[PDB]
Each structure stands twice: as C-alpha cells, then as structure tokens.
Design a protein around this ligand. Structure first.
Ligand SMILES: Nc1nc(Nc2ccc(S(N)(=O)=O)cc2)nn1C(=O)c1c(F)cccc1F
Length: 288
C-alpha cells in the first residue's frame, strides 16, 4: 500500500547506523502532524544500483512474509522521492544489536539470560526454515534486542530462498568467519550452514564480546595475524577441514561448548536441526 507510509509524514528522530550499502534511521510516522505517531525504523539503500534495488525488493518481500515473536516486525514500504525510490519500514528495537547489548549491559547478563537468547534465536530460525529461507548472515551483530527478555533476528539482506528441488542455494555473486566450510569451498548455503553459523553465534554469546575473543580475532590469531588477502581464506579452509575450531570461552560450560562443536560438523547432514537445538537448550534451562 503506497499511501500507508507517505514520505511527508515520516519524521526524522535519529541516525541508527550506516553501512556500505544500507543505512537505518529512527523516525516517527506522524500522519496527524501533532508531533505524535508510531516510532519506526527506516532502512534505505546506500550506493544503490538497479541490481541492489532488485535485491532490496526481495529483502522487503522476505521480511513481510515473516510473522514470528523472534523476527523483527515488518511495517511497510515508503515510496519516497515522489514514488521513484523505496524505503523499508520496520519496528524499532530500542537496545540495538545483541553484540552491542552484551558489551554495554553486562551488568544484567548471566548464563540464564544467554540461554534464553539462544533459545529465542533457535525458534526464530525454526520459523525461517519453514519458509525455506536461508539467512546466510546469522551473527550477534544481526540479532536485535527489544528488552532484557526478548531478542529478534534481523537483517535479511543476504537471505536466499531455496530452489524448489534443492536443499541448498548456490551463491553466484562475505562474513567468512561465520561461514560453514562448504560455503567457503563451494558457495553452498543451506539450513545446515545456518546451523553452523548459529554455533558461531553461541560462541559469541558465551564470550560476552570480550576484546580479542571475537571469531575474526581468534581465527586470525590461529592462522597468523600477518596473513593478508586470499591466503587468509586459504588457511581458514585448511584449518576448518582438519578440525580446527574456535576455543571454549572461559567460563563456558562443557555442555554448551559441545553444542557449539556439534553445530561445527564438517559433515553437513550430521549437524543438529534448529528444532533439536531449541529442545536441547530449553531442556538444559528447565533441568537447571
Ligand atoms: N529495526 C531496528 N531497530 C534497531 N535498533 C537500534 C539500532 C541501533 C542502535 S545504536 N545506533 O547502537 O544506538 C540502537 C537501536 N535497529 N534496527 C535495524 O534494523 C538495524 C540493523 F539491523 C542494523 C544496523 C542498524 C539498524 F538500525
């Protein structure tokens, strides 16, 4: 509906974040011009092209097709510049990314909270899988915090729909330290490579985003911090194929590390499902 969010009533409140190809703003949609209205987040392209606009349309369709408690809510589209451009309207989550939240609000984070967030992420990913969507960018920087009891998966800019006849999508066009080995070596993405990335997400959570413990910092320390360019990927592949893995974070229960290591299976079909993982995590919590 092109009259639902008219550019003239979308009022700027704050800049939230700019990347190479996207920017997000906090705005208030004020149809009565009474300095009220709903607070929303507005995503727009940066450095746009016809191909990026097309991908942006697919991203908007993906988000609109999702209705789940642990997925950022779609609100609509603004057809700005006299209906010659597109902006995506979605819900605004006050506490930002989970990565920043873990750094900033460690005073209210403990293992119980970490496993609650883990559970909610798994459920959101179960939901995504029923649409046969592959997120391809799961990371705590892309999970958002509504409040201390609720997180939601966001940033569907890399999300692909499986072909009807296949259980993987082959990208022909990269957060390499969250990638499964078969994504690095064959460009194959699947629910199982999303489960690999989720193991990296679980690792991040239990590192509490301490300095020098991020997956890039740890992998680079293992590979050699001097390495530059493609040699980095070469070494990353060789490491992963022969069982090199992120270490257990200090303070991390062996049981939780074992979840990480089972997600990090080189054998694509032996990784657990998101339903397995949700049940296992909620049973750990309920058994606690
Ligand atoms: N829908 C949404 N809500 C927010 N909340 C937010 C974002 C940033 C902050 S900040 N600058 O650290 O204080 C605080 C709250 N982000 N968000 C997004 O889609 C979003 C994203 F996915 C990636 C980058 C930026 C975004 F904006």
């Amino acid at each position: 509906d092109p009259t639902q969010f008219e550019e003239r009533h979308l009022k700027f409140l704050q800049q939230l974040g700019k990347g190479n190809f996207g920017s997000v703003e906090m705005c208030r949609y004020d149809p009565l011009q009474d300095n009220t209205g709903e607070v929303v987040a507005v995503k727009k392209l940066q450095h746009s092209t016809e191909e990026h606009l097309r991908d942006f349309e697919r991203e908007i369709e993906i988000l609109k097709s999702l209705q789940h408690d642990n997925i950022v809510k779609y609100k609509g589209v603004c057809y700005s510049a006299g209906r010659r451009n597109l902006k995506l309207i979605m819900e605004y989550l006050p506490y930002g990314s989970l990565r920043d939240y873990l750094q900033k609000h460690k005073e209210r984070i403990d293992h119980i909270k970490l496993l609650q967030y883990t559970s909610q992420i798994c459920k959101g990913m179960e939901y995504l899988g029923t649409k046969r969507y592959i997120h391809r960018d799961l990371a705590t920087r892309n999970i958002l915090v509504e409040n201390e009891n609720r997180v939601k998966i966001g940033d569907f800019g890399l999300t692909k729909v499986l072909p009807q006849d296949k259980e993987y999508y082959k990208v022909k066009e990269s957060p390499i330290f969250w990638y499964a080995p078969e994504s690095l070596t064959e460009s194959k993405f699947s629910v199982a490579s999303d489960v690999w990335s989720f193991g990296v997400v679980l690792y991040e959570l239990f590192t509490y985003i301490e300095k020098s413990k991020s997956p890039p910092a740890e992998f680079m320390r293992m590979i050699g911090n001097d390495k530059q360019g493609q040699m980095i990927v070469f070494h990353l592949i060789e490491l992963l194929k022969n069982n090199g893995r992120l270490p257990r974070p200090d303070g991390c229960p062996d049981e939780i590390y074992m979840i990480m290591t089972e997600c990090w299976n080189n054998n694509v079909n032996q990784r657990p499902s998101f339903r397995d993982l949700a049940l296992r995590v909620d049973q750990i919590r309920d058994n606690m």
